[PDB]
Amino acid sequence: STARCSLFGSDFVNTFDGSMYSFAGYCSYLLAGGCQKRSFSIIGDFQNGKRVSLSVYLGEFFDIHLFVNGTVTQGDQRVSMPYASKGLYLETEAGYYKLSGEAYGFVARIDGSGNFQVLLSDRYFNKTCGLCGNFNIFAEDDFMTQEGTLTSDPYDFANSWALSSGEQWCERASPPSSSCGLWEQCQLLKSTSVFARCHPLVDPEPFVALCEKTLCECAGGLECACPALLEYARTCAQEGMVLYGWTDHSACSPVCPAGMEYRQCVSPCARTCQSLHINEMCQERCVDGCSCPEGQLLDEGLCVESTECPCVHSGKRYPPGTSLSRDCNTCICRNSQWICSNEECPGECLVTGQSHFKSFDNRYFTFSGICQYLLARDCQDHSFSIVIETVQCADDRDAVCTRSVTVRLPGLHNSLVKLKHGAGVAMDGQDVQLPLLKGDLRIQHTVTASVRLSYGEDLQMDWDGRGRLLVKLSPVYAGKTCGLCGNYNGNQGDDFLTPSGLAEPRVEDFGNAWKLHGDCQDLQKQHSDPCALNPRMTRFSEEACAVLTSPTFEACHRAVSPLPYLRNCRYDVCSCSDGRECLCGALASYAAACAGRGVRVAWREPGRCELNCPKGQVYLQCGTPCNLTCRSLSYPDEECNEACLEGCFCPPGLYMDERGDCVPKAQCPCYYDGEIFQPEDIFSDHHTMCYCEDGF
């Protein structure tokens, strides 16, 4: 229940009804379409007599052009293949450019030689018109003009179906001039066994006549016969008899892409390096065209061995044996697949901005209750407990942020460490000079001036003093945690667990269940998208936070999803005491997640969020921390493995002093027994005699 037409060789056309003629086009002409009412139009585009493109127009709302050089254009814009829009699918099949519209009820193709073909479903039987004819049992009632007359002249018919446009208005074309050891090549259609199989189905006489015409027209050798033989073979295939020998019972080989070979009855659902197997549920008839050699596979239009097939990730191709990694896990490409590690990685709980959260299990949420809340605790061995104090941080009711943090360490003789606003620290209520190393606990100034805290290898924290807290746990705590950052079991789906042992589907009741004090108000509802309370802020909040999804972060968008950070940014900018600071904090938060996945973004610029350093220091997007301070000179045997990080650093030959000023190595003070000595200081004693030089 289908019919086929083709435009082929020099000038030839074969109707849906097997009437053949020659026509050198100069306009673009209607090949096929709905004749009484035009659901779609299929147009043959010509220049200087030659074909140049096949163009489909859908109603008047969409049009797509496919050129003989494989270029495609939609409207007036060039578009890359493969393509799909408005119910059309434009793709390679059997190495040849294909344009399918079987929702409308047609499919079309251009082969490597530039021959067009079109197939119409029986939906258009006796209901179509154009150069491909009128699609009915008769072949001789073709040549119907748009004037509705027959004509005996193919050029009156074809010019009657010419379509002018604003691109060019086109002349009535006319037959070319003519003046006519190769003739036997056309008689293969009659003489030669593979072609002779099809004589009960397709009469050779028109095709051999057209063959003799191309032998008159064409200036080449024996190859001048080949389009008529090819189109006869394709007509036989359409009539249901494939001519498997035709291309080697004759000298005629069709054009194919590099590394492919022409063959008959190529299957649809062609296998590729990247495609899962349909196990023969394709249920579609084979076609002629190019194939890769047997056992070789196609990849992105080129043939490669089955052992050569790349893997794909992040929209890119990688050869076998390539290792990628996500967090601590590595994925190795083998065959079509990634062999991916299955170990648990360090859990990064986060509190940031206007009380946005990330669970250890990567669940993002916002809560904005005001109380002391249990953020993260070892619920099994109680080796640590982290608590946050949340307060309203602007005039808005939705602007709520962490004011201070409290860490209780029962293993450290039940010490209580408070991380204060402005990045101060107190221990058991006493304010401490920040470089502290007593017991398993260590506390330090980060180059960001953020407080960093460590408690063995298995707990680390990083507090900015401005309501941002990052908590890192080793996999030793996996499954053991509790509080607002969840149970660290690798699953988002239970992070809203509560002390009652059920997961609240409401983030409000979840967060309320972790409040430490009974007179704190239960949060009744969390008002997402607070821009309604300050409508003046929404235009800037959108325009500014959209940078997170702009091209500047594009390298990061496949390393960390930007969508939670964009929601957090728009909330922050719409509802805080200074939206510029909240913008910079949200952008820094996403850039920090990128750096956690090893993607570094040059996102700062003079228009936004420059990290302007104190005098003598210089900004680095990435500098090494371990050798910045004079203390590093004074304890040069200390362990330090921390990664390169963003901050303000001294210029490459200078170390950083207690005043924050940058000093040469010879000018650093020396630190001994926790006590500070100037350059060239001497002391001598019954136990030791020592002197300060080069900060040591």
* 520 interacts with a copy of itself by CB under 8 A: no
Per-residue binder mask for Ca ion (CB under 5 A), 205-224, x = binder: --------------------
To ligand NAG, the closest distance from the beta carbon of 139 in angstroms equals: 12
**What pairs with residue 440 in β-bridges?**
none
User: How wide is the angle at C-alpha 100 spanned by C-alphas 94 and 105, nearest 5°?
Assistant: 135
Using the structure block, give the residue that is written with the tokens 């600071």: 581
Give the burial class of 353: count Cβ atoms within 10 A of its Cβ; 0-12 exposed, 13-18 middle, 19 or more buried: buried
Under the binding rule (CB under 8 A), the answer on residue 440 touching other proteins is no
Nearer to a copy of itself among residue 345 and residue 394 (C-beta): 394
Q: Is 606 in the site for a copy of itself (CB under 8 A)?
A: no
Q: Which helix (DSSP H) or strand (DSSP E) does residue 415 occupy?
A: strand 415-419
For a copy of itself, which stretch binds (CB under 8 A), given 161-169, 175-183, 410-418, 469-477? Answer: 161-169
CB 34 to ligand NAG: min, Å = 13
Q: What part of residues 15-34 is at the interface with a copy of itself (CB under 8 A)?
A: 28
| Choices 130-138, 181-189, 444-452, 534-542 (CB under 5 A): range interacting with Ca ion | 130-138
Smaller CB separation from other proteins, 411 or 679: 411
Which is closer to a copy of itself, CB of 168 or CB of 329? 168
Distance CA 696, CA 694 (A): 5
The least distance separating ligand NAG from the CB of residue 665, rounded to whole angstroms, comes to: 7
Give me the residues paired with residue 312 across strands: 317
Compute the distance between CA of residue 466 and CA of residue 610 in angstroms, rounded to an integer. Answer: 17
Contacting range for a copy of itself; rule: CB under 8 A; set: 143-151, 462-470, 480-488, 551-559: 143-151
- The span of 313-321, 465-473, 508-516, 530-538 binding a copy of itself (CB under 8 A) equals 530-538
Size of the site for other proteins (CB under 8 A): 110
Neighbour-count burial of 674, counting CB atoms closer than 10 A to its CB (0-12 exposed, 13-18 middle, 19+ buried): exposed
Q: Which of 223, 381, 395, 638 binds a copy of itself (CB under 8 A)?
A: 395
Site for other proteins, residues 267 to 296, rule: CB under 8 A: 269-272, 274-276, 278-279, 281
- Considering the rule CB under 8 A, would residue 57 count as an interface residue with a copy of itself? yes
Q: Which of 231, 29, 15 is nearest to 141 (CA)?
A: 15
Residue 142 binding result from ligand NAG, Ca ion, a copy of itself, none, given CB thresholds of 5 to 8 Å by partner type: Ca ion
Q: Can you list the positions of beta strands (E) in 40-140?
A: 40-47, 50-58, 62-67, 72-74, 77-78, 83-85, 88-93, 96-101, 106-110, 116-121
Per the CB < 8 A criterion, the answer to whether 322 and 333 are in contact is yes
Residue with tokens 């304010």: 431
Structure tokens at 40: 């779609």
Site for a copy of itself in 260-319 (CB under 8 A): none
For residues 190 and 539, which CB has a smaller minimum distance to a copy of itself in the complex? 539
Name the maximum alpha-carbon separation found in the chain: 125
Amino acid 307 reads T
Distance CA 386, CA 418 (A): 10
Write a three-state SS string for 527-539.
CCCHHHCCHHHHH
Of 74, 145, 296, 549, which lies in the binding site for a copy of itself, with binding defined by CB under 8 A?
A: 145
Instruction: Name which position in 150, 328, 532, 666 contacts a copy of itself (CB under 8 A).
Output: 532
Residue 396 binding: pick among other proteins, a copy of itself, Ca ion, none (C-beta 5-8 Å cut-off by kind): a copy of itself
For the bound state, the minimum distance from the C-beta of residue 311 to ligand NAG, rounded and expressed in Å, comes to 29
Query: Per rule CB under 8 A, is residue 637 in the interface with other proteins?
Result: no
CB of 376 to other proteins, least distance (A): 11
Q: Kindly state whether residue 330 participates in binding other proteins, applying the rule CB under 8 A.
A: yes
Tokens at 227, concatenated:
């389009």
659 near a copy of itself, judged by CB under 8 A:
no
Mark residues 353-382: x for contact with other proteins by CB under 8 A, - for none.
--------xx---------x-x--x-----
Taking the complex as a whole, the smallest distance from the CB of residue 514 to a copy of itself amounts, in Å, to: 23
Q: Is 60 in the site for a copy of itself (CB under 8 A)?
A: yes
Please, which residue, 530 or 623, has the CB nearer to ligand NAG? 623
Provide the token pair at 83.
Answer: 């393509």
| 47 touching a copy of itself, by CB under 8 A | no
Q: Is 486 in the site for Ca ion (CB under 5 A)?
A: yes
DSSP symbols for 331-385: EEEETTEEEE------EEEEEETTTEEE-TT--EEE----SEEEEEEETTT---E
Binding string to a copy of itself for residues 339 to 378, with x set by CB under 8 A, is what? ----------------------------------------
* CB nearer other proteins, residue 37 or residue 615: 37
Which among ligand NAG, Ca ion, a copy of itself, none contacts residue 305 (Cβ within 5 to 8 A by kind)? none
The answer to whether 74 contacts a copy of itself (rule: CB under 8 A) is no
Q: Is 643 in the site for other proteins (CB under 8 A)?
A: no
Peptide bond into 346 cis (omega under 30): no
**Position 572 contacts a copy of itself (CB under 8 A):** no
| Cα 410 off chain centre by | 47
Question: How many CB atoms are located within 10 Å of the residue 568 CB?
Answer: 26
- Strand 441-445 versus strand 430-431 pairing type: unpaired
169: CB partners within 8 A, 6+ apart: none
Q: Which residue has the tokens 């496949």?
A: 558
Q: Does 492 bind other proteins (CB under 8 A)?
A: yes
Judged by beta carbon distances under 5 to 8 A according to partner kind, the member of other proteins, ligand NAG, Ca ion, none in contact with residue 59 is other proteins
Residue 327 corresponds to which tokens in the numbers above?
């967090």
Half-sphere exposure of 640 (CA within 13 A, CB side): 16
Distances (CA, A) of 185 to 217, 477, 575, 594, 624: 15, 81, 83, 67, 77
Q: Which does 52 bind (CB under 5 to 8 A by kind): ligand NAG, Ca ion, other proteins, none?
A: ligand NAG
Spatial separation of the C-alpha atoms in residues 59 and 370, rounded to whole Å: 59
How many CB atoms lie under 10 A from the CB of residue 370? 19
Residues across the chain: 696
Residue 446 binds other proteins (CB under 8 A):
no
Which CB atom, from 111 or from 288, has the smaller least distance to ligand NAG?
A: 111
Our measurement of the distance from residue 307's CA atom to the centroid of its chain's CA atoms, rounded to an integer in Å, reads 26
Q: Can you give the binding site for ligand NAG, defined by CB under 6 A? A: 52, 67, 69, 71, 126, 136, 624, 627, 652-655
Question: Which residues of the chain come before a gap where C and the next N are over 2.5 Å apart?
Answer: 180
Residues that bind a copy of itself in the complex, under the rule CB under 8 A? 28, 37-38, 41, 43, 57, 59-60, 63, 145-148, 159-166, 168-169, 392, 395-397, 531-540, 543-544, 578-580
Residues that bind Ca ion in the complex, under the rule CB under 5 A? 17, 134, 136, 138-139, 141-142, 361, 486-487, 489, 491, 494-495
